[PDB]
Amino acid sequence: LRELIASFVSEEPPEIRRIRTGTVPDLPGSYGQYFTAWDFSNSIVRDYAMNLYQLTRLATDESVSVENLLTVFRTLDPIYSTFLGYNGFPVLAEYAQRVGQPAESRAELLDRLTTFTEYVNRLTAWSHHYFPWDLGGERYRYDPSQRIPVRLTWQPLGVQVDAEIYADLNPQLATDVLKAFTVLQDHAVVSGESMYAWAPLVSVAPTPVRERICDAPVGRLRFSQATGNKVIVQYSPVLGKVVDSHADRLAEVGKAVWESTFSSKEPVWLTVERL
Amino acid sequence: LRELIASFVSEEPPEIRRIRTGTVGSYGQYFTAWDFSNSIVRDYAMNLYQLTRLATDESVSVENLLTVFRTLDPIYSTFLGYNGFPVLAEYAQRVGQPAESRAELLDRLTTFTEYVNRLTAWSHHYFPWDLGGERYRYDPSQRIPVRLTWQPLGVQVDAEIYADLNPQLATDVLKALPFTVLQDHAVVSGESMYAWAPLVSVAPTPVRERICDAPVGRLRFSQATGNKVIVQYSPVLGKVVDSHADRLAEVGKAVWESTFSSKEPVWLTVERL
Ligand SMILES: O=C(O)CC[C@@H]1N[C@H](C(=O)O)Cc2c1[nH]c1ccccc21
Ligand SMILES: O=C(O)CC[C@@H]1N[C@H](C(=O)O)Cc2c1[nH]c1ccccc21
């Protein structure tokens, strides 16, 4: 599986192509319209994914017996598995059955859960990028020691900015984030002026320090292990802050990426490297 | 909750109305917030139904059950509460509170499921699937006869519930009869209509059948997906009689024009015969 997670960090998965073009073998969508089909594909795998992560996060809970975990999986999974497998994602289903296979140990289950979560998280990301959220706008309107420095670069925007990430604030989270990335950049479609990208990792570490996003300042950085393994730049568990001096570019980086996921479907990639 | 469940079976919830009128999104549009509300309620519903089914299982403690709830629920509950369904959230919080009997939980779970499944039913009906429509194109001794009718289309048909095929499912659905609910169409599956029946059945479904094998007039149940009643013009339930199968074509036409376009409610009543 991991081979194709890596493949799909660079390339759009073929599954996410047939869905946008309407070439799914089943031709889903009653009365010759795959708009409904596409919608179900996007949402079913997004929520299926959030489920997978939480299943994982309980694989880390030891009060639950692994056998009880496997059973909660055989209960929750098959409906999402089969429908997605019949509406655009055949392999994900088979791999879900591989995850449901008896776990000789708790760690084996945990590893399968996290791999597969990230597989479907990459697919979620790509669908999120190509789903036409635009039809709506036309009609429906209204310790200083531990801070590590890194640099975030948006191409082909050619805009770079710097950021600190407070390892002290969220140690387990920051270490996992530091462990790893050039990934497609997209915009939140309901929250407002924020962008996020699907970081290539599966962190189940608890986050003691979270912030209410209305208190969050500009260029605030946040990682959501739940809605993807997303990294979020606000122009919630907190990760870091883009330095104030460069906050002046984030706003147009925003408008650009909003056009990316709302209007253009033109890829906008974001790289995080550590200074 | 049950108070609200009954009230909603006939009346549009306030929540679905304010979201579909955008009087609860990014850059002054609500269609994304709507797409999210619709899908998250639908899927929180499937999750709740599988969690009740879990609640029947005796291998899992009620404390392990409650912690699997305390983790999978909030991501859906709190979010939906921000966009459309606040009371859904507060009641989810309360379902989580420590239960001392499997039954107490299982009851709150089932009512909450069905509350959410009605919210889903109304969301599916009002949700706009017409937008992409222009952009994206191409023992007989055992069965118990009942009858179905659609108003204001004024069309009826007699059908038989195969108790022999699914005894548990048959009883669970009959005990709700008579009822009259919203009938909507199947937006992805094809030529099938369905309606959200007012029950939450944990009945086994020993017999199931390919929807491609399902004849015209095939009645199937959808306990896994909103405990719905599906007529095809899957767990098996019944069949409309051969001489009445012909009357199903135009009501499917009208109900597709109802769910896809008009939104003018189409109601179906099922009564025992
Ligand atoms: O405060 C908000 O509106 C939501 C914040 C964030 N925004 C995303 C977007 O805007 O696309 C969608 C999304 C978010 N959090 C979630 C939790 C569960 C399921 C979906 C989401
Ligand atoms: O569409 C299909 O081929 C599947 C059959 C059914 N059809 C529904 C429709 O058409 O609205 C959508 C739907 C179905 N089963 C599901 C399971 C999970 C999530 C959604 C669904």
Print the SS3 string covering chain B. Answer: CHHHHHHHHHCCCHHHHHHHCCCCCCCCECHHHHHHHHHHHHHHHHHHHHHHHHHHCCCCCHHHHHHHHHHHHHHHHHHHHHCCCHHHHHHHHHHHCCCCCHHHHHHHHHHHHHHHHHHHHHHHHHCCCCCHHHHCCCCCCCCEEEEEEEECCCEEEEEEECCCCCHHHHHHHHCCCCEEEEEEECCCCCCEEEEECCCCCCCCCCCECCCCCCCCCEEEEEHHHCCEEEEECCEEEEEECHHHHCCHHHHHHHHHHHHHHHCCCCEEEEEEC
C-alpha torsion B171→B177→B183→B189, nearest 10? 10
Question: Distance (Å, rounded) from C-alpha A70 to C-alpha A101?
Answer: 8
Give B-chain residues touching A65 at CB under 8 angstroms.
Answer: 64
Question: Distance (Å, rounded) from C-alpha A43 to C-alpha B38?
Answer: 9
Locate the ligand 1 atom nearest the alpha carbon of residue A213 and give its number.
Answer: 1
**Could you say which residues from 209 to 228 on chain B have a Cβ atom under 8 Å away from some Cβ of chain A?**
224-225
Helix axes B62-82, A34-59, angle to 10 degrees: 140
Ligand 2 mean position, distance from CA B228 (Å): 11
- The nearest CA of chain B is from the CA of A88 a distance in Å of 12
Q: How many CB pairs under 8 A join A and B?
A: 173
Give the containing element (helix H, strand E) for A160: strand A159-166
CB A125 within 8 A of CB A198: yes
Question: Which of the 8 DSSP states describes residue A30?
Answer: T
The dihedral built from the CA positions of residue A97, A57, B222 and B14, taken in this order, carries a sign that is negative
Give A-chain residues touching B47 at CB under 8 angstroms.
Answer: 47, 51, 76
- What end-to-end distance do the CA atoms of chain B give, in Å? 31
Burial A139-178 (b: 16+ CB within 10 A, else e): ebeeeeeebbebbbebeebebebebbbbbebbeebbebbe
Question: Distance (Å, rounded) from C-alpha A240 to C-alpha A237?
Answer: 10
Pocket test for ligand 1, best of A190, A222, A223, A230 (most atoms within 8 A of CB): A190
Give B-chain residues touching A34 at CB under 8 angstroms.
Answer: 132, 136, 138
The runs of H, that is alpha helices, within chain A are 2-10, 15-21, 34-59, 66-86, 90-100, 106-130, 134-139, 171-179, 247-258
Q: Whose CA is closest to A177, among A272, A57, A70, A44?
A: A272
Question: Distance (Å, rounded) from C-alpha B157 to C-alpha B270?
Answer: 10
Question: Distance (Å, rounded) from C-alpha B153 to C-alpha B250?
Answer: 9
Bridge partners, A155 (sequence order): A269
Match 């900015």 to its residue by tokens.
A161
One-letter amino acid at B272 equals: R
Q: Whose CA is closest to A124, among A72, A89, A90?
A: A89
Question: Distance (Å, rounded) from C-alpha B118 to C-alpha B226?
Answer: 8
One-letter amino acid at B191 equals: E
Give the contacts of B63 (CB within 8 A, at least 6 positions apart). Answer: A63
- The nearest CA of chain B is from the CA of A120 a distance in Å of 16
Residue A3: count of CB within 10 angstroms of its CB: 7
CB A150 within 8 A of CB A162: yes
Give B-chain residues touching A133 at CB under 8 angstroms.
Answer: 31-32, 35
CB A197 within 8 A of CB A177: no
Ligand 2 mean position, distance from CA B199 (Å): 19
Question: Distance (Å, rounded) from C-alpha A117 to C-alpha A199?
Answer: 12
Task: Note whether A82 contacts B: Cβ–Cβ < 8 A.
Answer: no
| Burial class (CB within 10 angstroms; exposed 0-12, middle 13-18, buried 19+) of B174 | middle
Question: Distance (Å, rounded) from C-alpha A125 to C-alpha A128?
Answer: 5
Q: Which residues line ligand 2 (CB under 6 A)?
A: A 40, 44, 79, 83; B 186-189, 225
CB B40 within 8 A of CB B80: yes
Residue B46: count of CB within 10 angstroms of its CB: 24
Ligand 2 mean position, distance from CA A29 (Å): 10
Question: Distance (Å, rounded) from C-alpha B50 to C-alpha B206?
Answer: 17
Give A-chain residues touching B30 at CB under 8 angstroms.
Answer: 136, 140-142
CB B169 within 8 A of CB B201: yes
Residue A55: count of CB within 10 angstroms of its CB: 22
Instruction: Verify whether the Cβ–Cβ distance A136 to B35 is below 8 Å.
Output: yes
Question: Distance (Å, rounded) from C-alpha A108 to C-alpha B240?
Answer: 50
Give the contacts of B50 (CB within 8 A, at least 6 positions apart). Answer: A75, A76, A79, B224
Task: Note whether B90 contacts A: Cβ–Cβ < 8 A.
Answer: no
CB A207 within 8 A of CB A240: no
Of B31, B68, B129, nearest to A72 by CB-CB distance is: B68
Give the contacts of B243 (CB within 8 A, at least 6 positions apart). Answer: none
CB A28 within 8 A of CB A202: no
Match 């769910």 to its residue by tokens.
B259
Pocket test for ligand 2, best of B189, B221, B258 (most atoms within 8 A of CB): B189
Locate the ligand 2 atom nearest the alpha carbon of residue B43 and give its number.
Answer: 19
Question: Distance (Å, rounded) from C-alpha B39 to C-alpha B191?
Answer: 22
CB A180 within 8 A of CB A254: no
Give the contacts of B132 (CB within 8 A, at least 6 positions apart). Answer: A33, A34, A35, A36, A38, A39, A132, A135
Question: Distance (Å, rounded) from C-alpha A270 to C-alpha B270?
Answer: 56
Locate B190 and state its tokens.
């094809």
Q: Whose CA is closest to B217, among B161, B151, B154, B178?
A: B161
Q: What long-range pairs does A68-72 form, CB within 8 A, spacing at least 24?
A: A68/B59, A68/B60, A68/B61, A68/B64, A69/A103, A69/A106, A69/A109, A70/A100, A70/A102, A70/A103, A70/A109, A71/B54, A71/B57, A71/B59, A71/B60, A72/B54, A72/B60, A72/B68
CB A182 within 8 A of CB A271: yes
Whole-angstrom Cα Rg for chain B: 19
Ligand 2 mean position, distance from CA B189 (Å): 6
Question: Which of the 8 DSSP states describes residue A209?
Answer: -
Resolution of the solved structure (Å): 2.9
- Largest Cα span, chain B: 62
Give the contacts of A136 (CB within 8 A, at least 6 positions apart). Answer: B25, B29, B30, B31, B32, B34, B35, B131
Residue closest via CA to ligand 1's atom 4 equals A191
Question: Which of the 8 DSSP states describes residue A246?
Answer: G
Angstrom CA distances, B269 to A30, A65, B215, B219, stand at: 24, 46, 22, 14
Q: Which residues line ligand 1 (CB under 6 A)?
A: A 188-191, 227; B 40, 75, 79, 82-83
Locate A51 and state its tokens.
């489920």
Question: Distance (Å, rounded) from C-alpha B128 to C-alpha A190?
Answer: 17
Locate B156 and state its tokens.
């009826």
Question: Distance (Å, rounded) from C-alpha B183 to C-alpha B197?
Answer: 10
Of B22, B29, B50, nearest to A79 by CB-CB distance is: B50
Question: Distance (Å, rounded) from C-alpha A187 to C-alpha B26?
Answer: 9
Last residue before each break in chain A (C–N > 2.5 Å): 142, 180, 235
Q: Which residue of A has its CA nearest to B33?
A: A190
CB B52 within 8 A of CB B202: yes
Locate B74 and state its tokens.
């909030």
Bridge partners, B231 (sequence order): B193, B219
Q: What domains are defined for chain A? A: 2-132 (no CATH), 147-274 (2.40.100.20)
Ligand 1 mean position, distance from CA B225 (Å): 24
Give the containing element (helix H, strand E) for A147: strand A147-155
Locate B103 and state its tokens.
């039954």
Helix axes A34-59, B31-56, angle to 10 degrees: 50
Whole-angstrom Cα Rg for chain A: 19
CB B105 within 8 A of CB B63: no
Ligand 2 mean position, distance from CA A180 (Å): 38
Q: Whose CA is closest to B267, among B179, B177, B208?
A: B179
One-letter amino acid at B133 equals: G
